[PDB]
Structure 1
Amino acid sequence: GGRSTGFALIYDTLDFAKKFEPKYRLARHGLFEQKKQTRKQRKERRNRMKKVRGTAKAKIGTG
């Protein structure tokens, strides 16, 4: 103990900080956590999107 280096990013205002704001890195003090996926099943719904044309409203029954 007695030495613990780190980074600090003092913006000007929060809404101007609300432009740059790496969100996944903001997410520790993120009040803004949305849209869980989780990236393994989103492919499987995307591949089934390719086999229906025009409407794409039949994959409610595929999970």
Structure 2
Amino acid sequence: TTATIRTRKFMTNRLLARKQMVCDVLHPGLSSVNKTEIREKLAAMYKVTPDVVFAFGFRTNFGGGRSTGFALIYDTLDFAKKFEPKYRLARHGLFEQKKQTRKQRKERRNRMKKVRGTAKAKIGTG
């Protein structure tokens, strides 16, 4: 497989303790890569404990054979859970909360406008 992850546009910043990096991934024989096995071999790039890799952005070139994609390396495991647009941990699966469902929720906040303080209507019928 071996994926030949070669990295460019490399720059680090301790403004948010990160390593900005775009990586060139080659697709030699089979298909486009899956993200979770790039992790432990980009944890063979600098050995940065593969659950803190977060290499989430990719697009395969035309014809088949290449992929230039973004990889932001946090330094610590909870600086990875500090700044972090939270739907990126929705991909690196740790979070799924609160069905709303963004239509039933936006009629919750309008139905409970006709109560006064106590909200005695939410306890009876539902």
TM-score by length of structure 2 reads 0.45
How many Å apart are 1:30 and its aligned residue? Answer: 2.7
* Percent of residue pairs identical: 100
Q: 1:60 to 1:44 in 2, by over 3 A?
A: farther
How many Å apart are 1:57 and its aligned residue? Answer: 3.6
Q: Distance in 1 between matches of 2:90 and 2:125?
A: 32
Q: Relative contact order: is structure 1 or structure 2 higher (C-alpha 8 Å, sep ≥ 6)?
A: 2
Which has the larger share of helix? Answer: 1
Q: 1:6 to 1:48 in 2, by over 3 A?
A: same
Q: Report the secondary structure of 2:70's partner residue.
A: coil
Q: 1:62 to 1:39 in 2, by over 3 A?
A: farther
Q: Show the counterpart of 1:30.
A: 93
5+ unaligned residues in a row in structure 1: which ranges? none
TM-score by length of structure 1 reads 0.81
Given that 1:48 and 1:59 are in contact with CA atoms closer than 8 Å, whether structure 2 keeps it comes out as: no
Q: Report the secondary structure of 1:43's partner residue.
A: coil
Q: Distance in 2 between matches of 1:8 and 1:45?
A: 39
The RMSD of aligned alpha carbons is 1.7
Superposed structure 1 runs of 4+ greater than 6 Å apart: none
How many Å apart are 1:60 and its aligned residue? Answer: 4.5
Report Cα offsets for 1:8-48 as digits up to 9, x if no partner: 01000111111111111221113122112110011111111
5+ unaligned residues in a row in structure 2: which ranges? 1-63
